Amino acid sequence: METFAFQAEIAQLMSLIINTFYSNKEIFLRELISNSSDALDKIRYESLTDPSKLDSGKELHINLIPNKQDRTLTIVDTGIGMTKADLINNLGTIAKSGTKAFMEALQAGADISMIGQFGVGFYSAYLVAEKVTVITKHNDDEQYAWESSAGGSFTVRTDTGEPMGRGTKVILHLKEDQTEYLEERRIKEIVKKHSQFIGYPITLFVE
Ligand SMILES: O=C(NC1=c2ccccc2=C2C1=CC=CC2c1nc2ccncc2[nH]1)c1cccc2ncccc12
């Protein structure tokens, strides 16, 4: 396990999301589903030039998996996935530029719900999660786990968990007062409100 420091801008955005009073927390789910949809569109498009890119799995889907015992909500997709360089380097560049644009937009009067327009919608996970774990597998690299509970650092390690084929799992270790996002009726309500037209099957698992 390697430990990395967040740069100042993204660290400030994580604190803003964790500390600001903002009741409309449900938008995190739309943001993560949108990220999954974009990752699925990317692998699908690449497969039109190179069909062997789906040798790691033909199915293009999104699964929502609540676990009351573990207090986790997992968003699983079979999209393009992320390489180690994406996790450490490329996405750090996006986090910095997207945060700067978002903070500029907020100071003007924009809302936290607009975070996805700045490419950093993933960070809306911190509206509901104390810790976020990303398990990912890209065709050009091995399976990795990125993780952060904020506090200025994140970790990356090769993941020895169940092999994924290709894609990403965003595991939300929910805050104690955010367990409504484990309830079937609540998740169904949010998906119907914000994600009804996503171009991939979204399966809401139950317990
Ligand atoms: O939105 C996506 N992911 C991510 C973010 C989106 C924007 C910025 C940083 C993102 C990161 C995401 C996942 C894991 C780490 C990460 C990150 N690395 C960093 C290094 C240094 N500083 C800050 C950092 N933030 C995403 C990307 C590609 C395929 C996907 N598939 C499904 C769901 C999400 C994705």
UniProtKB/Swiss-Prot annotation:
Recorded GO MF terms: ATP binding; ATP hydrolysis activity; ATP-dependent protein folding chaperone; CTP binding; dATP binding; disordered domain specific binding; DNA polymerase binding; enzyme-substrate adaptor activity
Keyword vocabulary terms for this entry: Acetylation, ATP-binding, Cell membrane, Chaperone, Cytoplasm, Host-virus interaction, Hydrolase, Membrane, Mitochondrion, Nucleotide-binding, Nucleus, Phosphoprotein, S-nitrosylation, Stress response, Ubl conjugation
GO cellular component, one term: apical plasma membrane
Subcellular location: Nucleus; Cytoplasm; Melanosome; Cell membrane
In-chain residues carrying the UniProt-annotated modification N6-acetyllysine: K42, K68
Effect of D77A: Impaired ATP-binding. Strong interaction with HIF1A, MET, KEAP1 and RHOBTB2. Loss of interaction with HSF1 and ERBB2. Los of interaction with TSC1
Effect of E31A: Strong ATP-binding. Strong interaction with HSF1, HIF1A, ERBB2, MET, KEAP1 and RHOBTB2. No effect on interaction with TSC1
Function: Molecular chaperone that promotes the maturation, structural maintenance and proper regulation of specific target proteins involved for instance in cell cycle control and signal transduction. Undergoes a functional cycle that is linked to its ATPase activity which is essential for its chaperone activity. This cycle probably induces conformational changes in the client proteins, thereby causing their activation. Interacts dynamically with various co-chaperones that modulate its substrate recognition, ATPase cycle and chaperone function.
Family the entry assigns: Belongs to the heat shock protein 90 family.
Subunit structure: Homodimer. Identified in NR3C1/GCR steroid receptor-chaperone complexes formed at least by NR3C1, HSP90AA1 and a variety of proteins containing TPR repeats such as FKBP4, FKBP5, PPID, PPP5C or STIP1. Forms a complex containing HSP90AA1, TSC1 and TSC2; TSC1 is required to recruit TCS2 to the complex. The closed form interacts (via the middle domain and TPR repeat-binding motif) with co-chaperone TSC1 (via C-terminus). Interacts with TOM34. Interacts with TERT; the interaction, together with PTGES3, is required for correct assembly and stabilization of the TERT holoenzyme complex. (Microbial infection) Interacts with herpes simplex virus 1 protein US11; this interaction inhibits TBK1-induced interferon production.
Designated name of the protein: Heat shock protein HSP 90-alpha
From-to range in the entire protein, with total length: 18 to 223 of 732
